[PDB]
Design a protein around this ligand. Sequence first.
Ligand SMILES: CNC1Cc2ccccc2C1
Length: 330
Amino acid sequence: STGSATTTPIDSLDDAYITPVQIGTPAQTLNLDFDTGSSDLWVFSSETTASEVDGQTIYTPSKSTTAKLLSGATWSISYGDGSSSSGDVYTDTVSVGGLTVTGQAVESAKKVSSSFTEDSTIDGLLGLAFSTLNTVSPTQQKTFFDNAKASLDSPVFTADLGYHAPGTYNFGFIDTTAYTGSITYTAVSTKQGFWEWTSTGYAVGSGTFKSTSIDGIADTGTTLLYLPATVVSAYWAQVSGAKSSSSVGGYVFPCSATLPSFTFGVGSARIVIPGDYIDFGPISTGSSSCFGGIQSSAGIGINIFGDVALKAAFVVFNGATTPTLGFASK
Ligand SMILES: CNC1Cc2ccccc2C1
C-alpha cells in the first residue's frame, strides 16, 4: 500500500504544517502536525478540558463505531519548547492520504498547555520518530508509520515541505518526480529515538564550505534550524546589524536586510537554504526587528534540523531494518 497527503503551512511564516487525518468510523477529519521529533499521535477531543479548547476540531470517540478504550492506558508528553499535553487512549482506524491503519493508538487529550490552546489551526500531533519514545503507559504504543510499515510497498515515508506553499507527505514510495538530481543517503542513530544523523559541514552565502561534523535530528515538528553557537555566529556575522537578543530570545536582524543563504552538507552533497527561508518576520507587529530562522542550539542539548532546513530538500525517512535518511535538492 501507499499514502499521499498534502501538508499546508498554518500561517504566512511557515510556523508549522498541518496534514488532514481521518480518524474513526464515520471518518472525523482532524488537521495534525506531523512531527518526526516525537512518537505520540494525540488529538484534541471531547475529553479535553473545555477552557483549553479554542477553535480546534475535536475527536469524539463515542461517535466512532470502531473506537475502543485502551483500558488503563494514559499518556503525558513535554516538548522542547515547554509545551505539554496528557490524557487517555483509544484505539481506532486512522487513515492518511488513503493509507489506513486499524487499531492505531489515538491519544485523547484531557489537558493541553496554553500554546496548544492558542493555536486554533493544530488539532493534534502525529508522531513519526521511533516508537521507543512513545509515552503511553503502562503499554507503550507504536506510531502510525510503525503500524503501517509492513503493509507499505517500501518501508519509507518522505517529507516535501513547501516554502510559503503546500507540500506533501508520502508513505510507502519515493516520488522520483519530486526532486532534482540524486538522493544522498546518510546513516541514522536511533539510540535517542530520533532520526539522528551527522551533517558534514556548512557554508554561509557564497563562502567556502567548512568540513565539520554536526550531529542533529531531522525534526519536521520544529520550525527553525538550531545549530552550534559557533556556526550560528558565523552566519549572523554576515548580516549587518544582526545580534543575539536575550530579551527577544535569539538572533534578530534588521527587517531591511537581504539574508545570505546557508548550505549544509549531507555526505559529499550539499543542500542550500535560500536566505528568504531564514526570515521569520517582525518580532512584534510593526517592528523593524525581524526574527532569525537559524538559532543556537546551545541551551537544548541537541542540534535540530527543523523546517527551515528540511523545506529546502526532499527528505526520505527510510525505516528499513537499518534506518537511514535521504536528502535531495528540489
Ligand atoms: C519541538 N517541537 C514540538 C513542540 C510543538 C509545538 C507546537 C506544534 C508542534 C510541536 C512539536
